[PDB]
């Protein structure tokens, strides 16, 4: 079964995986792409792409804070709000991949540690074209020039996410697809500090396996797509180290920020 | 990692 797999074991999966996904995470690929296209029927997503714009639409998204400041530290502090949301998303992920919680729980921690902004990075194109990215569970669309135009280093954060984002989302991957992809990424056996490397790359062995059957079903002409799909996962890398030398940056140059609690514990001693 | 702990527990 989980030690040995057939097809129809990988499909089980694959499914099973594709589930806890619609259950952990709000906004899929599917409705986002509904809404950057107008196929909906819901209203359209405020726009926000200048000072304001900003100002008028913070109205409109889910943002909880205690009162001001300038832009780019505002959009910041947002960024902060909902990286807290998407790593407790993550993390509730993580529970439903069969086997992760019967891991040491310093392990399950250390490959959270690890894993969720990369997952963060990958599911960030779900929400994303060329010119903009979706926010607050598709109530705004923030404009890629403005995000791009911040003042430095708060500019340099966002244009390398969205460059991996177009080239990413040419794989034309569906919500199906990304469930064992992100799952793939959080059982990676290389993590830094590991105590028992065995039993994570036994589950990402079976995961691979679902990933790559996945990928030939629902790609049937998208041939060596599981192959492109690998390399991605060291580029996920890169913009780790980049962001976290930007964080660095700004801890220093920015001496009234500070990040929340949950994200300082996972920048802490992070490689 | 308090919170990771707390979130993984529940
Ligand atoms: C390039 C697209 C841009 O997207 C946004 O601005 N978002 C989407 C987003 C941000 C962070 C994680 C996932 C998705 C965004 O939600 N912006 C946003 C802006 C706001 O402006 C006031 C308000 C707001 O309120 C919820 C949200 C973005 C920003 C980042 C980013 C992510 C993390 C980050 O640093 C922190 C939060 C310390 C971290 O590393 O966890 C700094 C910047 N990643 O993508």
Same mark, same amino acid.
């Given at each position: 079964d989980q030690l040995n797999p057939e097809s129809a074991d990988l499909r089980a999966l694959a499914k099973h995986l594709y589930?806890?996904?619609?259950? &952990?995470?709000?906004?899929?690929? =599917?409705? =986002?792409? =509904?809404?950057?296209?107008?196929?909906? +029927?819901?209203? &359209?997503?405020?726009?926000?792409?200048?000072?304001?714009?900003?100002?008028?639409?913070?109205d409109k998204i889910k943002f909880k804070?205690?009162? &001001?400041?300038?832009?780019? !530290?505002? !959009?910041?502090?947002?960024?902060?709000?909902?990286?807290? %949301?998407?790593?407790?998303?993550? +993390?509730?992920?993580?529970? &439903?991949?069969?086997?992760?919680?019967?891991?040491?729980?310093?392990?399950?921690?250390?490959?959270?540690?690890?894993?969720?902004?990369?997952?963060?990075?990958?599911?960030?194109?779900?929400?994303?074209?060329?010119?903009?990215?979706?926010?607050?569970? @598709?109530? @705004?669309?923030? +404009?890629?020039?403005?995000?791009?135009?911040?003042?430095?280093?708060?500019?340099?954060?966002? %244009?390398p996410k969205f460059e991996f984002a177009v080239k990413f989302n040419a794989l034309e991957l569906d919500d199906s697809d990304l469930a064992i992809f992100i799952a793939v990424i959080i059982l990676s056996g290389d993590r830094p500090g590991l105590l028992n490397v065995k039993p994570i790359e036994d589950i990402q062995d079976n995961l691979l396996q679902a990933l790559e059957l996945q990928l030939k079903l629902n790609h049937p002409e998208s041939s060596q797509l599981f192959a492109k799909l690998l390399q991605k996962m060291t580029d996920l890398r890169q913009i780790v180290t980049e962001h976290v030398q930007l964080l660095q940056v700004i801890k220093k140059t920015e001496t009234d920020m500070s990040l929340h609690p949950l994200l300082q514990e996972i920048y802490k001693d992070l490689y | 990692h308090k919170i990771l702990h707390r979130l993984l527990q529940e």
């Open positions: 589930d806890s996904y619609i259950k &952990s995470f709000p906004l899929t690929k =599917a409705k =986002a792409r =509904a809404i950057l296209t107008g196929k909906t +029927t819901d209203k &359209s997503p405020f726009v926000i792409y200048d000072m304001n714009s900003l100002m008028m639409g913070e804070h205690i009162t &001001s400041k300038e832009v780019a !530290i505002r !959009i910041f502090q947002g960024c902060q709000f909902r990286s807290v %949301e998407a790593v407790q998303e993550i +993390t509730e992920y993580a529970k &439903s991949i069969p086997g992760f919680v019967n891991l040491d729980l310093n392990d399950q921690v250390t490959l959270l540690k690890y894993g969720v902004h990369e997952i963060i990075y990958t599911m960030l194109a779900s929400l994303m074209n060329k010119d903009g990215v979706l926010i607050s569970e @598709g109530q @705004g669309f923030m +404009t890629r020039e403005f995000l791009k135009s911040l003042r430095k280093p708060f500019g340099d954060f966002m %244009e | -």
